[PDB]
Each structure stands twice: as C-alpha cells, then as structure tokens.
Design a protein around this nucleic acid. Structure first.
Ligand SMILES: [Ca+2]
Ligand SMILES: [Ca+2]
Lengths: 251, 257
DNA sequence: GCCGGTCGACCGGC
DNA sequence: GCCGGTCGACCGGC
C-alpha cells in the first residue's frame, strides 16, 4: 500500500477538518479532502478513477475505438474493475472526457510502477449506533477473483479502505477519527455478504481482521468458496422467509 | 387520494416553472431537482394545511396530542391499526424515549415522504423528481418484502380502506443555469396490476418503475389487489432463489470443486 | 427493447 | 452481541 506509509499523517491532517451539512446522511465531502491530502503528498500517483481513464486515453491518442482502448489496461481484471462501457469508451475524446460516475469501483486510485491501489473512502457518523456500511458488491468481488485466477493476476492491485469518522456539532461535521484496512489481509470465509443490500459485503473498517497469512491466490479461492456457499444458503433462507410465511394468503 | 382532486392545479402551477441548478455543480441524484420537491410540499402546506405532514411530523403530532400516553406499548395503540403501525412506527426504544424535548427527526428509511391524513384515511405520498433527458434507469420504489408484510396485515386485520400509496413525479430539464419543469405525473400503486410489478431482488428487494409508466388499469378490490400481489411476490421469490443458483453458484464451482 | 447489478450509508429486533 | 432489511438513484450488455 502506498497509503499505509503516510497514514497517521493523513490521520492527523484529517482530524479537526469540517464539512458542512446528518439529515441527508452524507459525510461524503470528506472523500474530497482525503483526495486533497493525497493529491499533494503523492502527486504523480493519485488519480480519481475518472481522472485515471482520461490520462490513460490522453497518453495514447493514436489509439481509438472501444476494442483497442480496452487493450490499454493490459489486464482483463483491471479492465473489469475500472473500465467504462463500450459506447462511453468508443465516444471518449479529449473534448468529451470522462466525469465522475456513481458506479465507479474506487474513489481514489493510486498507481505506481504497473501497480494499482484501489482506495475507497468510507465515512461513519460515530454518534449513531454501529451499522456496517456497504463495502463492495460480493458478486463483483466474485467475478474479480475468477478473473484473477484465470489470468494469474495476483500482484497487480489491492483494494484498501479508509474510514473517516465524524461527529456533528450544530451545523458542521467534524472528523473525530480515521481508520485504515486492507481487503486482501482479511479472512475471506469471514466476510459478511448482505444479499438484500445490493449483495454488498458489509463491515466497519475499524473492525476488519487483518490477519490473513496465505497468498493472494489462496485468498481468491477461499472467498469464492465462501461466496458460493453463502449464495446457496441465501436461496434456502429466501424460501423460509419470503415463501412459507405467505402461503396461507395464497389460494 | 387528496392529491388527485387538485392535481390539475399542482400541474398547472408547476409547468414551465424554473428553479436553480444544484449548488453542487453536478446534475445527478436526489440533489438535482430537490427544490421542486420543496415547492410541492410548500404548496401542500399552503392548500391542505390540516392534512399535510412529513412522516416524522405526523408522529410528533400524534404523541404530542395524547401527552398522557406513555410507553411504546400504549403509544403504539394510538395508531389504531396494526397495518398503519407497521408502516409508520419508529421502533420500541425510540417510541419509549420520545418526549416533547426529544422529538422525532427525518429518518433515512422512513416509509413515507409526505403524509396526507384526514378522517383516519392516509395517503402515503412520494413526491419524486426526474430528469427525462437522462433518466432511463428505474428507481427503487419500495421494498417488495415491506409490501408483502403490508398486504398480509391488511388481510389479517381486514383493513382495505385505511390508506393509499401514491406518487407525484416532477420531470425537469436543464436550461444552462436553471431547471425547467417540463411535465408532471401522478400514479397510484393500488391501481397497478400487482403481477406487473418488477421486483429487483439484488436492489434491496425493491419494486422498480418510473411512475410515468406505472400501469393504472386495475379494477378489483383492495383485498384482491393484496392477495394478488402476495401471490406474485411468493412466485417471484421462488424464481429468484433458482436464479441465484444459476448465476452465483454454478459459474463459480469450477474454481472450488 | 428487455433485465438487473452497484454506490452510499443507516437501526432495531431477536 | 449479532444479523440483515430500507431508502434513493443510477447505465450498459445483450
Ligand atoms: Ca467510497
Ligand atoms: Ca421522494
């Protein structure tokens, strides 16, 4: 992780900051200032996901078309996580340019020497009761592991997280704490997948275990086994909860 | 419906009207067009003053009027309906801790947007906003499961004339600096054919549609609508259980077996 | 045209 | 302590 090192400096620079308004339930602007720090202390590595695609496309003008522009990622896995649709890629131009999209996998992307660090910022209102937030689609992760195994890409990227905790005074959100964690350092089989919540894995960054000791490959195989098993159980529990209880009303 | 009777008015006072573009610079999300929503509510507060409440306001008023009723148990009786209670209540502890100095505030997952109530009849209104130029992805309308529980309670308690669940969409267009209201739409969930409702299971098990497209040609009873929807919900839940297997299990076995 | 997966957080029941 | 449902939007591959 390129963020692990300066973490603490970013922790200390974040505590005290204030973003304006928990009615709308969004401490999202905190993401912006984390980027503010990273863009200064780590200039040539920090990219907003859309900013990175603009760059990859701007440094290869002779290359156009959705088919060729996709080849530029040189990784089916990286391609899957960061690329945009065919038309969006077919239509991209130095005059059109990608903007930010609600669907992007990561908030900030740190690249350096063919290596990527997908950073996703999480914001928690620590005043309220603990409720694990969506982290990432468990299905997206599933497909990603499949593509990792298939293509042997086990040293290309990591998916890390930064949890900015905040408290509200009267009319200003103030950061009280921060937390950092790595996805691939956790135990796969113990990642909670909430099927109803957009099949999102859910956990507070401050509570994720970081004791995984196997390899990146073993991680992906373990997770996949976990995913398949939970998928099977979900089907059974969907029957006991959404079918059996409503049988009497059916005639 | 309290809205429909004056829908022509809301529409005839909304069309062409223009409001500022989101300060956030963007143009996507609940943010863009929100002023249109504040406009609709203010119109409602100005013309249906004794019927308009935000969900939390209705609850504050309900408990404020019976200051002698304390404890969630008794406080839950003030609803005089197991169905209404299910749709609007705030939770045991929060109902227990409610006080004239600790009132309810807007909550992210509240069932209703705007409540129009009169003579114990409730209209759960959802005032929505849409950018017809972009917008081509149907939004989450309401949890299919919440509806399922709602219908069961309606059947068990035989409450088929207690409430309606309607929609008021405000379609706008970007005009450089402003937002112009190009049109409005009104639809009633209970005038829709139950089995024609699309339940997106991955999307928080939410029913999804635009409203401008909601079917409004159901001609049966409320009870029928309920039994019918429940039928649709059970059958669709079965399919989904099968789909999951075909989609999330099978294609991944070759990696684990 | 038809279908459905994904981002962002956020309580209350058992 | 611990599990999981709900709100509001959003876009591209068949
Ligand atoms: Ca994020
Ligand atoms: Ca609304």
């Amino acid at each position: 992780s390129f963020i692990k090192p300066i973490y603490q400096d970013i922790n200390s620079i974040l505590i005290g900051q204030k973003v304006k308004r928990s009615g709308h339930a969004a401490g999202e602007p905190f993401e912006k200032l984390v980027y503010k720090f990273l863009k200064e202390n780590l200039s040539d590595l920090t990219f907003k996901q859309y900013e990175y695609l603009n760059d990859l496309f701007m440094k290869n003008p002779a290359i156009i078309g959705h088919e060729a522009r996709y080849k530029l990622f040189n990784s089916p896995t990286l391609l899957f996580l960061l690329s945009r649709g065919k038309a969006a890629t077919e239509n991209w131009s130095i005059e059109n340019l990608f903007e930010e999209k609600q669907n992007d996998t990561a908030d900030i992307l740190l690249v350096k020497d063919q290596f990527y660090e997908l950073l996703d910022v999480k914001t928690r209102n620590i005043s309220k009761s603990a409720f694990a937030p969506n982290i990432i689609s468990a299905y997206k992760l599933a497909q990603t592991c499949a593509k990792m195994i298939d293509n042997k890409e086990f040293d290309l990227f990591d998916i890390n997280y930064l949890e900015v905790d905040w408290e509200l005074n009267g009319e200003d959100l103030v950061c009280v704490s921060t937390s950092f964690a790595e996805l691939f350092k956790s135990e796969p089989s113990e990642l909670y997948i909430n099927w109803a919540a957009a099949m999102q894995i859910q956990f507070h960054v401050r509570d994720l275990d970081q004791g995984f000791n196997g390899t990146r490959e073993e991680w992906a195989k373990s997770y996949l086994k976990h995913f398949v098993t939970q998928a099977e159980q979900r089907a059974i529990s969907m029957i006991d909860k959404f079918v059996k209880p409503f049988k009497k009303y059916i005639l």
